[PDB]
Amino acid sequence: DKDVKYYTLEEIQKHKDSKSTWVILHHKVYDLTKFLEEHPGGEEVLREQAGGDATENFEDVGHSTDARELSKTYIIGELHPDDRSKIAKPSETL
């Protein structure tokens, strides 16, 4: 479509509520906020893994190929490469 944007966890972390839930997967962030009541998984399920790494939590159920393409539609932006290796969780400075 056009030059994508480099989204960061520090930011996404903000939108970690129903109002706006994000989820990183395959070095790529996607928006499913509107796909909350559309996901055959539930809502609290997405939230539980909002603004965080849900790769394993996603691949766990081996998302159907159609899902791998669905995301494309519900795309938002790309997650910084020097961010994914941050695994925002185990503190930053401490």
What residues are designated binding site for heme?
39, 63
From candidates 8, 33, 55, 57, binder to ligand HEM by CB under 6 A: 57
Distance spanning both ends of the chain, measured CA to CA: 40
Check binding of 30 to ligand HEM (CB under 6 A): yes
Check binding of 15 to ligand HEM (CB under 6 A): no
DSSP three-state, residue 53: strand
* Helix (H), strand (E), coil (C) string for 24-47: ECCCCEEECCCCCCCCCCCCHHHH
Q: Which is nearer to ligand HEM, 70 or 88 (CB)?
A: 70
Longest dimension (CA), the chain: 42
Give the shortest CB-17-to-ligand HEM separation in angstroms. 14
Check binding of 79 to ligand HEM (CB under 6 A): no
Binding site for ligand HEM (CB under 6 A): 23, 30, 32, 35, 39-41, 45-46, 48-49, 54, 57-58, 61, 63-64, 66-67, 70-71, 74
